[PDB]
Design a protein around this ligand. Structure first.
Ligand code: D3T
Lengths: 138, 69, 69
DNA sequence: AGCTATGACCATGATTACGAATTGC
DNA sequence: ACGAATTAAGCAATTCGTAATCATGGTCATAGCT
């Protein structure tokens, strides 16, 4: 700021992040995909009208979260809600054919699914927060 | 006070740019007593008005001075 | 490759800046300060005027990566 | 009582300028 | 027209729709002659 106020050019990186990056490694970087934690997530909320992320006035009903280091899906289900209370979800029925009441979900994907149902939204959100702390995605 | 007819429209932007692209940035700032000159772009009346501000001297373009007074 | 944070890939400005800075530092040089300019439009590529009639036999040519070349 | 030339109209056709959505080098 | 603190790939091109404006065909109305 002082050099700008005097009016002389201040040479070098104004952003220190990549400056420290270059000073730290210098040589080329050898990486590994399996060591970097990449996570995917998907959200479903049941409500009378379209829920607004700017408000989030409706509860969250379906949580799914895939992690790459453990290549594992975590599924959170709420058994009861003000918009409707429902039973659990069975993996076997999902793998069945549509004509037989199934959902055609592949079995190999089902092999990597871990289920944790919760009765109320608060417990589900606590579990999601604590797993996020335990499993911090890159 | 540095004035002239339509000075902020042609004279200043032209002198500044020519000195910048012929002599360099350091020579261009020599005009400012405190070596501090800045360039802004105004998109009014088909834009293209690179109003130059020199810190230490006052630009008082005579065209608008006569227009409003 | 550019020794830059992950998100910066969404902006080519940052990745090109980082890689050029790395190349310059590797040879013990110094990059200039971010100056200041104004947005301008300059002429783009050229395209001919085809006669909208059926053309039986056509040959096609191109130059590999025109602008870097 | 009917054919027909012509004015009004009502919409129709046509041209221009501008905003917008989409390619493609 | 001075707000004043600040920020992130580019241009050339077609095609359609809308809004504004001028020229006009089909048809209706007037009417005039037979
Ligand atoms: C696509 C694209 C291209 N360009 C410029 C860059 C130079 C030319 C053609 O190079 P392209 O990469 O199209 O040629 P390429 O496909 O690499 O060459 P071939 O035609 O495969 O020989 O156009 C650009 O500015 N932005 C773009 O998004």
């Amino acid at each position: 700021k002082r050099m700008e106020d005097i009016g002389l050019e201040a040479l070098g990186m104004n952003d220190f992040k990549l400056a420290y990056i270059s000073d730290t490694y210098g040589s080329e970087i050898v990486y590994d995909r399996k060591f970097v934690r990449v996570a995917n997530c998907d959200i479903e909320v049941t409500g009378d009208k379209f829920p607004d992320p700017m408000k989030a006035e409706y509860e969250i009903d379906a949580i799914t979260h895939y992690d790459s280091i453990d290549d594992r899906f975590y599924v959170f289900d709420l058994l009861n809600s003000m918009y409707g209370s429902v039973s659990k979800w069975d993996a076997k029925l999902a793998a069945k054919l549509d004509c037989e009441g199934g959902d055609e979900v592949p079995q190999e994907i089902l092999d990597r699914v871990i289920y944790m149902p919760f009765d109320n939204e608060r417990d589900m959100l606590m579990e999601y927060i604590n797993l996020w702390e335990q499993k911090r995605p890159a | 006070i540095f004035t002239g007819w339509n000075i902020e429209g042609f004279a200043v932007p032209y002198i500044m740019n020519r000195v910048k692209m012929i002599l360099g940035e350091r020579s261009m700032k020599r005009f400012s007593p405190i070596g501090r000159v800045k360039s802004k772009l105004i998109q009014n009346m088909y834009g293209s008005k690179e109003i130059y501000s020199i810190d230490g001297v006052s630009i008082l373009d005579y065209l608008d001075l006569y227009k409003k007074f | 490759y550019a020794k830059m944070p992950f998100s910066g890939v969404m902006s080519p400005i940052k990745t090109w800046d980082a890689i050029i800075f790395n190349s310059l530092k590797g040879e013990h040089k110094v990059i200039p300060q971010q100056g200041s300019h104004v947005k301008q439009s300059f002429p783009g590529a050229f395209v001919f005027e085809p006669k909208p009639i059926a053309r039986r036999y056509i040959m096609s040519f191109d130059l590999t990566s025109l602008y870097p070349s």
